[PDB]
Design a binder for this molecule. Structure first.
Ligand SMILES: O=c1ccn([C@@H]2O[C@H](COP(=O)(O)OP(=O)(O)O)[C@@H](O)[C@H]2O)c(=O)[nH]1
Length: 440
């Protein structure tokens, strides 16, 4: 009866929506995770308190994304099959005596809203990106900013007290500042907001103290309510643990605050040359490091670079990232600065080396370095290349610089406020409780 519909196969949208769903189950609601038939056949289910249900994206037996690597093509296929099968699911669930009370959906599936509203099901948008990025996309949707969005447009928003930092060219969201590079992602980013005013509720995985001006503006403009960081309650010190993963055993043997965790997420791909610069930078830093290089990227790693990494590092295809970040051995996180990774670092008080690619990452990386003060951003050379020397410099700058304590201080400060927000009486907890009562 509360249906949860993340963008399919995006763990960064899945995890936080499941964590919201767990808190709703605490309040006595009944959550169901809605995923594709493919993901359902090929992934273990979430377990209690969740039911699971399926829709189709056109590809029930193979990965549709794999088959349809042009983003606009995959997204029109998902819309056509998904909208049909979501409507069928709303009816089958009602016929099975489990009518949906509300659909909480990722607005990167904007067809979900129309499908649900036409079945008479309430709708709640769930934004898994930061308010600062979200509100820029909403301004374009509302026809208050043209494309492309410029630094001058961002400076206006700063001047008006809506953004808390002045975004330059390398900081504005590329999907709207350089829309020709990613047409389908531009349109998807802006369409999140088309019809959002028709929703019963709008939720965002952030907390007001982290993004005060932006959260306030999202609330006044879009009715968006902060409900994050939407993470396991253990990490938030909310009293209302420890795996057997082999990389964790490695981490246990390293000294306190010694290790660099390295990940560029599950989406972006790095060519052989970029992997070479990244891995050599890690080895040249002299620090112990845990390098996540996905199974689907690891063919790009040479024998000699892997051997070089054996001295002080460990390369894995996946790690339990929250458990790593919480570990006493972890000193910093060299991250692409996707929002889930950034929130996970904040909740654990871990300083950041930001290596953004696209989406929300450039904007987050500017916040990290220039407002929040919790790390540094790598500087690309004149031709856009990340050099091993710069990877190394940034690692050493956060772990050893004159400013080491500045990044730590800010990470810790933010950590405390993130926990406050989710604990009883906190700004995000209040919004969760409001929602749970509404739908009880
Ligand atoms: O090796 C791992 C292990 C866990 N995750 C988890 O998967 C989610 C999505 O991560 P990603 O970095 O792609 O998200 P983003 O930071 O870009 O939003 C986050 O909850 C991560 O903690 C991961 O991404 N890589």
């Amino acid at each position: 009866q509360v249906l949860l519909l993340p963008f399919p196969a995006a763990q960064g949208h899945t995890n936080p929506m499941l964590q919201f769903g767990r808190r709703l189950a605490y309040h006595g609601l009944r959550p169901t995770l809605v995923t594709t038939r493919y993901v359902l056949s090929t992934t273990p289910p979430p377990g209690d308190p969740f039911r699971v249900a399926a829709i189709s994206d056109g590809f029930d037996d193979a990965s549709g994304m794999a088959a349809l690597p042009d983003p606009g093509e995959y997204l029109r296929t998902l819309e056509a099959h998904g909208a049909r099968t979501l409507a069928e699911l709303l009816l089958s669930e009602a016929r099975a005596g489990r009518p949906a009370r509300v659909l909480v959906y990722d607005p990167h599936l904007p067809w979900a809203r129309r499908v649900a509203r036409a079945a008479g099901v309430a709708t709640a948008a769930f934004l898994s990106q930061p308010c600062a990025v979200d509100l820029i996309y909403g301004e374009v949707c509302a026809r208050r900013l043209a494309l492309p969005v410029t630094p001058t447009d961002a400076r206006g928003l700063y001047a008006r007290g809506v953004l808390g930092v002045e975004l330059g060219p390398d900081d504005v969201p590329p999907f709207v500042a350089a829309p020709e590079l990613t047409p389908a992602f531009c349109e998807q980013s802006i369409e999140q907001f088309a019809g959002l005013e028709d929703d019963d509720d709008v939720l965002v995985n952030s907390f007001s103290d982290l993004e005060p001006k932006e959260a306030a503006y999202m609330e006044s403009t879009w009715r968006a309510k902060t409900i994050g960081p939407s993470l396991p309650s253990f990490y938030l010190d909310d009293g209302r643990f420890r795996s057997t993963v082999p990389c964790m055993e490695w981490l246990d043997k390293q000294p306190p605050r010694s290790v660099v965790l390295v990940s560029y997420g599950v989406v972006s791909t790095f060519d052989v040359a970029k992997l070479e610069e990244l891995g050599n930078g890690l080895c040249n830093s002299g620090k112990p490091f845990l390098w996540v290089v996905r199974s689907n990227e690891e063919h790009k790693l040479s024998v000699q670079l892997r051997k070089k990494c054996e001295k002080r590092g460990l390369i894995v295809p996946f790690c339990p990232q929250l458990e790593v970040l919480a570990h006493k051995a972890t000193g910093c996180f060299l991250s692409h600065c996707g929002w889930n990774s950034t929130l996970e670092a904040i909740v654990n008080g871990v300083p950041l080396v930001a290596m953004p690619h696209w989406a929300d990452q450039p904007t987050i990386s500017k916040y990290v370095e220039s407002l929040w003060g919790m790390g540094v951003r790598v500087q690309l050379d004149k031709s856009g290349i990340l050099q091993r020397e710069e990877v190394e410099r940034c690692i050493r700058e956060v772990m050893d610089g004159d400013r080491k304590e500045d990044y730590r201080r800010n990470a810790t400060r933010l950590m405390k406020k993130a926990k406050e927000s989710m604990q009883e009486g906190g700004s995000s907890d209040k919004n969760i409780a409001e929602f749970a009562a509404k739908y009880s």
